[PDB]
Write a protein that binds this ligand. Structure first.
Ligand SMILES: Cn1cc(-c2cc(-c3cc(Cl)c(F)c(OCc4ccccc4Cl)c3)c(=O)n(-c3cccnc3)c2)c(=O)[nH]c1=O
Ligand SMILES: Cn1cc(-c2cc(-c3cc(Cl)c(F)c(OCc4ccccc4Cl)c3)c(=O)n(-c3cccnc3)c2)c(=O)[nH]c1=O
Lengths: 305, 305
């Protein structure tokens, strides 16, 4: 028992991290089969970062201007293209540590692991959620661009995130691995703000199930509610509306604990309206929304990869 | 910027995890050079777990009763010994993925990464602290025994923890890698309780420095205090006493932020005496004590391994 913010084992990804240098810029890259993926702003200087013409910038570059290093192995670049906001460098050697993998675009509210890297060197691993507003609340310093997020299912790594920038508010924005930004952001230094965020209701409920499974049960009450009534409360407190699809996804946890989803919604309504009273749930003084229902069952079952 | 509960990249350790089977028991093992390390209760049955005679139990076993599997590679066991509460199995093949490593016993209040494993398969990675009472608040299910904690410095893995058991209170106990338990625990199913725990004051202060570095600064006040005065407050609220050695360790963070340690102690005293008022610090509604000063500087500097 116990409940932690747990990340996937990062080994399969550590072996894909390389250092990509173009001119003065060095940042991180992802080496899979014979292709290296990195943020296309690798080709930018300080100026022209306020309205970079990436086509015109990429045209001044040749295969030999892109230095790719994996450890001290120097890769030979034989092609280069740009796809959306990602640069794709074709190299003459297939990465011998390429795991089984696919590229996936994740939905808001889903979670993934981040392997923060600097100069192509892995530094730390942590878990986090795509916010409803398509930001992530990361921990990233200058030089972390090209770090990636991922999920792992048995032996298959699903890459879903590559890190591109930090907004003036300290939150983070990036692309899927086809280079398409999550949310409204562009890779220019212009004034761009994230939309209104919200709390991930279905994740908050999965976490209350996780709390009951571990014995943190003081918040259960003898009330119940309706989807409609609960969604009234969710809107007052800036919670995502709860749908029938969310209820269904909570079905397994409902069956394991014997607590109906609408009953757990009545617990959550009581907590939103009255706060926690200085008590704690699974070691937290606030409602956590960065565990999906899948995360709760994985960690309350003992699943391996 | 941003601040996360970050674990070390677990790749160097994933390659050392094996599955050890003795009779009906399968659990996790650590393969380094030509030696596999695992909890010695691998040789126990359900009964005789209430007062196992490990010497007499180990005497009924031969090299060939210990099945070590790494993936589907079957290792050939050529020797076996017991050291404290750890079994050491000599195998005829050196692990080709053995990282640079050492065995270290860590001090209470220090942090480390845990690679939870089941049937020799890595499942998740998370960070946590050796509590002052020599427990860890983990996330572990049945089958996780033999999972290890570790820190990494450049290329050297320092193994400090191997997981042995969960206490009736849901907290976790284990050994260093020479098999010596942390704290008062024994590997028998008898009634044993952890001592009174406390909060890790120097870690709480390092985290308040981390909060100021990231812009969470509402808790700063214009008061100061003395070590002696602050330690009066620490004792009332069950905080570890603060020593001159703790102040010195906070020296770097003091110099970077320009906030004297005794000034930050006056902030902490205000928070202990008045609570947080429903506000948050680095996304938390309570005082976090599982980041050491080293952890804060690593994550607020961009250090790689
Ligand atoms: C050359 N170079 C550059 C970077 C690098 C670039 C960026 C970065 C990239 C682009 Cl396209 C930007 F439009 C940008 O504008 C910030 C901004 C965005 C939106 C509205 C207003 C503003 Cl002001 C910033 C970055 O945000 N970070 C970073 C820093 C801290 C944490 N996370 C990410 C790092 C790097 O890491 N290595 C390296 O060699
Ligand atoms: C055969 N076998 C056994 C285990 C296994 C053994 C144990 C375990 C090992 C020993 Cl020596 C015990 F004295 C023990 O008594 C619990 C206890 C301790 C102190 C006071 C009172 C009591 Cl009642 C328990 C365990 O605690 N866990 C576990 C479970 C959940 C989370 N973390 C750890 C697992 C395993 O994983 N695989 C496998 O094959």
């Amino acid at each position: 028992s116990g409940f932690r913010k747990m990340a996937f084992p990062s080994g399969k990804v550590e072996g894909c991290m390389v250092q990509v240098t173009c001119g003065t810029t060095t940042l991180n890259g992802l080496w899979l089969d014979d292709v290296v993926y990195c943020p296309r702003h690798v080709i930018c200087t300080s100026e022209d970062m306020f309205n970079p013409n990436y086509e015109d910038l990429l045209i001044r570059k040749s295969n030999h201007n892109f230095l790719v290093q994996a450890g001290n192995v120097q890769l030979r670049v034989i092609g280069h293209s740009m796809q959306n906001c990602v640069l794709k460098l074709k190299v003459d050697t297939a990465n011998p540590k390429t795991p089984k993998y696919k590229f996936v675009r994740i939905q808001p509210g889903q979670t993934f692991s981040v392997l923060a890297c600097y100069n192509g060197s892995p530094s730390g691993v942590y878990q986090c959620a795509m916010r409803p507003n398509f930001t992530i609340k990361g921990s990233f310093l200058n030089g972390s661009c090209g770090s990636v997020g991922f999920n792992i299912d048995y032996d298959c790594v699903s890459f879903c995130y590559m890190h591109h920038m930090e907004l003036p508010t300290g939150v983070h924005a990036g692309t899927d691995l086809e280079g398409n930004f999550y949310g409204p952001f562009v890779d220019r230094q212009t004034a761009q703000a994230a939309g209104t965020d919200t709390t991930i209701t279905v994740n908050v409920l999965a976490w209350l199930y996780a709390a009951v499974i571990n014995g943190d049960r003081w918040f259960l009450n003898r009330f119940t509610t309706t989807l409609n009534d609960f969604n009234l409360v969710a809107m007052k407190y800036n919670y995502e509306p709860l749908t029938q699809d969310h209820v269904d996804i909570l079905g397994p946890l409902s069956a394991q604990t014997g607590i109906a989803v609408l009953d757990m919604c009545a617990s959550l309504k009581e907590l939103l309206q009255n706060g926690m009273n200085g008590r704690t749930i699974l070691g937290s003084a606030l409602l956590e929304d960065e565990f999906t229902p899948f995360d709760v069952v994985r960690q309350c079952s003992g699943v391996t990869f």
